[PDB]
Design a protein that fits this description.
part of a larger assembly; 6 chains; A alpha+beta (100); B mainly beta (101); C alpha/beta (556); B: 101 residues; mainly beta; Urease, subunit B; 4-stranded antiparallel beta sheet; two-stranded antiparallel sheet; 1 helix; 10 strands; 38% strand; C: 556 residues; TIM Barrel; 2 domains; binds nickel (II) ion; Urease_beta-like (chain B)
Chain lengths: 100, 101, 556, 556, 556, 100
């Protein structure tokens, strides 16, 4: 696979997101690292799918609502940023005020 | 589209051009396979191979660099040899020359 | 004896006339020459050529190379040629024909008991990359760049502090000293940039005497005519380079006033197109000048569909300002000025609006997008892209070396230079190399299961090798110092452990010296439309949909 | 020119009178003072103040600081104040007003070409923590504590061996020597504890002369009156500290007999409440004494619903015995004696009934649980928790420093001490810091994608920085030795590479010297009920249901 | 006072007569002797024996050990015995009875203030393994082998280059030098093998003088009569060993001609069965000779159902050739010649047709498969497998040590040798050790959650300890050099930091000296059937279905 | 669990395979590292199941077809190799020309 350090690092982010995805499925309100992992892994899969930077900036705001996360969480995450390989190379997506 | 593919120019390549060559009949009189590499000092191969050693003196097999010729037990072939170049000094092998020729 | 050309290519790698596609791009290289004698190539293995009395001779160590890379197809600014490469005392010994002179003809790289072998047949070998726009935000950037094929890192910083996050500056003798000591731990050659912004030349001479090989003038520290003038006076005095991030705000003057302050003195303009920083909207016009060595940083290489959305937000994250800075018109033209030889170096802008492991892949993405849009360069001679390939490889190898006065040690595969080499399988050319050699030892390479019967079973990922460990790493990397620091014995005073190299020729280099990238166009930027023109012709291009060297290779 | 107080807080961080909630606790700090001149704050960036001729001056390196942390809100035992912090030669230069004296008024921290900047506006800055109860079970505890904001680690051990698993002891000159050499590899300041249990003082003087800065008396090696007496005689002789884990079994006498053996000599009683070890059920009464510096270890901080189940089993895993040792009554009282200043230090008991990355967070959990149960301290002055905050921060900073005779080098943000500082975003105060600085260089910090365009994209996790690498790490950490070892040249004999500090004042320190934690209560423990009383009043508290600094922050 | 034998075993580990199953194998060891005085065993803990005035005495450091491993059940070539082990100055001090002579009888390992303790009760303790067939393909193989219980690694290579991928050779003085410097970073003792194939003895003397402790003759470099003769002449001259991978192709002669070229001189034949390389199909017959020290590499240990499919493909991946090389007949016989003492060492062939972390587990799998097929060895005395266990442990400990002239420093648990020891829980014997000690310090061990209250909560995985860090690691490992390199001051010239050991006795050792493995059978291989016979009797065995030390232990 | 370096390393390969397994489920054509991870993790589970080296050499060629992977992918993977603990110890499986 000839994985570079940056690929192995995203492997960690993906796994942290699996933890959150299973907890949300059980009906828990997510905490800070959980919420950041879930949304950011989601944005990595949208780049893999060939979605645009512009689209993912908006879709990323619909992954978690104020109701699915603990108190204070929305205020601890003013944005979430993650880069992924889009069909046109690595791009930065910043999802602004993601949780409402 | 194949990533990193070659576009090889058609044709053939002539190897060891300009060098002296000879052919010698070789027979594996041993009972175990013997395989000889392209640059080995032919005259000094496994004693079980029978051929005119005097003829092969200062020669190697005239084959693609890196490749070898195999002799099963009892197998008999005519091989083509090409003379060594450079200083034509042979050291090693069976320790039979160990100097110039 | 004959062998068909296909069998021959299969056995020893391609020869004269054969072509190779670079990765999944539309770029094709054609072998220009082959330094072998057909029938006499050396290959290592069971029953192969490199064996005692055969391709391997009787010589003592002094009379043979330490390492031979067999049947490499070299891609460098000087040619695309098939050859054996001999490395001796950590340096490039010869490019030629390896073997034993006792029995082989034309041997120029002698192989003996003291010679190790790396089998390069079927691979492409390049010099290691040289990235001159590093922000020392974290030490992790070292392995990241090294894995990408970048062997020399020049920049400044002290770690994740606001000054370094913004600028390539290691401020002051104490941080410079700490950073030189920290460099010994990293498996890449390193040179430091001090903070160039001050109007008292003594505070700069002190940083230079401390060890910096250049000075960064950055607008966040005030890129004023006076600061720029002071740093250039010191640079001329101490033979060190000045890298410039200009006054985007046009606070102290317009790009012509900064130009009047440089006064025809040598300077390296970072991110010359201007999205990474500089006089809005016309910093790009700096590439017209003979004393300017212009580089681009990488997030705008090449221009793509997501480029603007991404950058506009990126800039906002780090309104009339944002808009005067990020412009499609200058972004669209930069790919072409690279194509034309008007921009000379590519570099990262590491974790400060640039990607540390993407300097080489993006440089190639741009060559592909230009071939696709513009066709063959006027310089091209046969049915291949050899000239364009030499023009772009020069941008991340020899040109950054010359710009920073280290081309005497690194930058290309040439006799006498440090043996920093990168071995690539053509399918992964420019994205994932097969082997990264630092000063003659392999420093990082893809490696499979450590417990496996062979080194190839999964998972295969980049792992540091022997040239990346302790004192062998120190022996195989260089720390670059100024002539003043070297003369004052900074190396001995800080007990630096690595080999030391000294920069020189940082003031003498000019645009005419950038290999295959010496164009000085009569370039303008329209104040109102921001269109870029050279002699009245609009310089522009179209954003890529999809790029090669992207989704086929990367897990994320 | 005016600016509203909210805009001002948004721009430069909070000022006099403004309040800040510590993490998700009920604790609120109020800015007591601000050392700036309104209009003259320094901020770094594009068009900002810290630029040549402006907030940055013309001075040579000697005349300016190496580093400035701008607009920090300092929380330390001496005050909660807004100020710029200047660091020079790896040490705290000044707490005051940074800038250029050529154009700015009241400048006490001069900024020049040689100055790097860390932007502290909106952050809280503290001294690095000092954990004095480390078991050297594994070297991994170093980064773990450092990430938590702990910069100094004192303890003993040789790795995962039975002696170290049980006690904080590095037995003998050879292991002490190996451990001093191993310390050079770790990015935290370290001092070693030798095995104090022996009745022949020469075997202790040898360990002291070898390099230990203290001696651990632990009941697993026999915490008898004679052993304790011998170690105290040596400690008095060589100015090194004695840390005590007493005879829980009451084998050699009761807590009064151990008390008679110490004979009014200075000693640090580890886990003074007694669940971590000590005379059952009354070791807690040691905090009444003037010569006792008492600490708690962390698993009983604060008292919670799972505490007893967890500890009873924990103790069984490592019956009348278990029950005499783990007691709700002494566990419930310890939170309050911390609240009252009767217990002076918090510490871990690393991987030996304590958690190495939880000393700071638990100390704060206890302050929160006490505010919640008890209200404001008698010492409080305004509508904030400033006094309680200074009382508890002193427990993991200055008090452990004073206890171990290293307060001259570390322990607080004061001029002349080592620049070990921790930068926190208030939302993550006490749990996950923004930046950990060791002797003036950042040694560890959260770091996003190494290949990203900025340092913030995900995954963000703690990665070692330049102050944690090789010889820069050695320059930025201290190895503490005894006066005897320093005088005998142990540093030179073991070729230790780090900077060396010498402990002193380990016998002179007493309970009256523990900052904001000098209470000597007339404390009793009932033999039958184990109730704790001070002057007849029952000291008790309720177990927490839920704590702040817990599930909102941690992935597991 | 009496205690039942079961309670006694539970408290102190098993004693004379008790038996222990090795892991999940069918192998059982019986305690042969116990060096204690019943009632006087030493145990460390709360209220235990090792406390001041009790099991711990008043002696100064010089008069006590640095470390005691209490109640260990030693398994070594010389016996399976219960004893305390004292380690002092990084070396084995005594095997006997630990304690305080002031109150205890028969004390031979004195314990004082300067003594650390590792509790070995219920564990089995062995010497560290010695793997002599390492290909230095990557530095990661070091920790991998160390975790497996292998403390000494001998081999050659320069990293992931074609020469090293194929052969255990570090060619030439420059690579030898770089590899000696790199060795300082690794926590295992290391000796290097140079390239032995050349017919000019001076090119070999140079490699020897450079630091190699042996020379590898490999057919990929031409394993001709002349090359072999030259290396043996040098080896005899410089007291260094020759390791042989013979001419599989029978190019220069048959196995008898290679045998005539060695001419009765000492040599170590690698992978003697021949699937890993050698004269097809009869290299195996080399074990008949008195001057041959024969080892096997590991992928054919033991013979199993997947063995042939796997190897035939493996060999094809790295037709009449493949088939002449991989043979069921010689593969089936090798297990038995190991059983018989005719093959003397086991080794890996690391990432070059062998598995670096499987030398010990496979050696035990073979002992189990032989007990299962063949029953008790003729040498067995009681109802246990003690003789077979001593016969096989000798294959990866003392025999490789003697073969390489380092048995004076390592190879067994004997007084005066380096304290390289491995502590095993019997259930995980041979697969996952509890503690790996390098020269007296623990260098790697399983370690649970670094932040936990104890070192046991999950995840538990192998982590490097204090004996694996910087200068403590250098103090605790050896770099082995030739007598010539040591005399020429190679250590000082390369500034090697580790302790240095010198090999000697590499020519004098012979088959009669391989502990419990000295058989010289009249072995033949049929040219046509490849059947192996010793004195006309067919030597063969059946492939295992399933093995112990496999799926019950490993996650993948 | 006393995980050795080699066990923790296969943990990485398994996770890289989870990424690919989820993308293939969404109907994407897999890329190079994805395809190598998916097949190799599959072979590790067949060893765990007690299948033979010989069998896994053939079954491994039926995991991904030319249609489920991007262009050039089949040509970038002439074989995939991975070792796992079979009931009879660690064995190397090479899956030759896996994708057609
Ligand atoms: Ni810039
Ligand atoms: Ni920059
Ligand atoms: Ni304790
Ligand atoms: Ni403790
Ligand atoms: Ni071999
Ligand atoms: Ni081998």
């Amino acid at each position: 696979m000839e994985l570079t350090p940056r690929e192995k690092d995203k492997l960690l982010l993906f796994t942290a997101a699996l933890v959150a995805e299973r907890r949300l499925a059980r009906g828990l309100k997510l905490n800070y690292p959980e919420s950041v992992a879930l949304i950011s892994a989601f944005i990595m899969e949208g780049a893999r799918d060939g979605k645009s930077v512009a689209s993912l900036m908006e879709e990323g705001r619909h992954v978690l609502t104020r109701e699915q996360v603990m108190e204070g969480v929305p205020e601890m995450i003013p944005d979430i940023q993650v880069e992924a390989t889009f069909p046109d190379g690595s791009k930065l997506v910043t999802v602004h005020n993601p949780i409402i | 589209m194949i990533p990193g593919e070659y576009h090889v120019k058609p044709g053939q390549i002539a190897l060891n051009t300009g060098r002296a060559t000879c052919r010698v009949v070789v027979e594996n009189h041993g009972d175990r396979p013997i395989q000889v590499g392209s640059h080995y000092h032919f005259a000094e191969v496994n004693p079980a191979l029978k051929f005119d050693r005097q003829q092969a003196a200062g020669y190697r097999l005239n084959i693609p660099a890196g490749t070898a010729v195999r002799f099963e037990p009892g197998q008999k072939r005519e091989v083509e040899l090409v003379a060594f170049a450079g200083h034509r000094a042979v050291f090693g092998f069976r320790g039979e020359v160990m100097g110039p020729l | 004896s004959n062998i068909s050309r296909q069998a021959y290519a299969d056995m020893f790698g391609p020869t004269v006339g054969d072509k190779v596609r670079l990765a999944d791009t539309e770029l094709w290289i054609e072998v220009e020459d082959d330094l072998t004698t057909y029938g006499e190539e050396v290959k290592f293995g069971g029953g192969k050529v490199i064996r005692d009395g055969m391709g391997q001779g009787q010589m003592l160590a002094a009379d043979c190379v330490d390492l031979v890379l067999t049947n490499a197809l070299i891609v460098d600014h000087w040619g695309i040629v098939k050859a054996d490469i001999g490395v001796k005392d950590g340096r490039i010994f010869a490019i030629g024909k390896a073997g034993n002179p006792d029995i082989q003809p034309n041997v120029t790289i002698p192989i003996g008991a003291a010679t190790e072998v790396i089998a390069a047949e079927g691979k492409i070998v390049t010099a290691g990359g040289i990235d001159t726009h590093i922000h020392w935000i974290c030490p992790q950037q070292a392995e990241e760049a090294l894995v990408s094929g970048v062997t020399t890192m020049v920049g400044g910083g002290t770690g994740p502090a606001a000054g370094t996050h913004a600028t390539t500056c290691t401020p002051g003798p104490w941080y410079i000293s700490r950073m030189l000591q920290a460099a010994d731990s990293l498996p890449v050659n390193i040179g430091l940039l001090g903070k160039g912004n001050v109007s008292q030349p003594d505070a700069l001479r002190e940083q230079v005497a401390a060890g910096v090989i250049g000075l960064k003038i950055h607008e966040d520290w005030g890129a004023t005519p006076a600061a720029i003038d002071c740093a250039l006076t010191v640079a001329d005095e101490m033979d060190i380079q000045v890298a410039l991030h200009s006054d985007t705000l046009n606070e102290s003057g317009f790009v012509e006033d900064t130009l009047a302050a440089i006064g025809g003195r040598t300077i390296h303009t970072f991110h010359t197109e201007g999205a990474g920083g500089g006089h809005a909207p016309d910093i790009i016009t700096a590439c017209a000048h003979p004393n300017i060595l212009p580089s681009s940083t990488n997030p705008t290489l090449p221009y793509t569909l997501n480029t603007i959305d991404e950058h506009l937000d990126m800039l906002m994250v780090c309104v009339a300002f944002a808009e005067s800075r990020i412009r499609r018109e200058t972004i669209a033209a930069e790919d072409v000025l690279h194509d034309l030889g008007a921009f000379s170096l590519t570099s990262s802008d590491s974790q400060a609006m640039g990607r540390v492991g993407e300097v080489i892949l993006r440089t190639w993405q741009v060559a592909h997008r230009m071939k696709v849009q513009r066709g063959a360069l006027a310089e091209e001679t046969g049915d291949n892209d050899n000239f364009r390939v030499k023009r772009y490889i020069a941008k991340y190898t020899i040109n950054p070396a010359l710009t920073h006065g280290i081309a005497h040690e690194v930058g290309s595969i040439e006799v006498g230079k440090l043996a920093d080499l990168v071995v690539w399988s053509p399918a992964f050319f420019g994205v994932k190399p097969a082997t990264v050699i630092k000063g003659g030892m392999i420093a990082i390479a893809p490696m499979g299961d450590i417990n496996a019967s062979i080194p190839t079973p999964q998972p295969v990922h980049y792992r540091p090798m022997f040239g990346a460990l302790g004192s062998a790493r120190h022996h195989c990397r260089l720390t670059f110092l100024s002539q003043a620091a070297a003369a004052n014995g900074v190396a001995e005073r800080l007990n630096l452990r690595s080999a030391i190299a000294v920069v020189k020729g940082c003031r003498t280099v000019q645009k005419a010296d950038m290999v295959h990238n010496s164009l000085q166009p009569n370039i303008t930027v329209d104040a109102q439309t921001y269109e870029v023109r050279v002699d009245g012709e609009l310089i522009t291009s179209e954003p890529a949909d999809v790029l090669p060297m992207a989704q086929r290779y990367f897990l994320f």
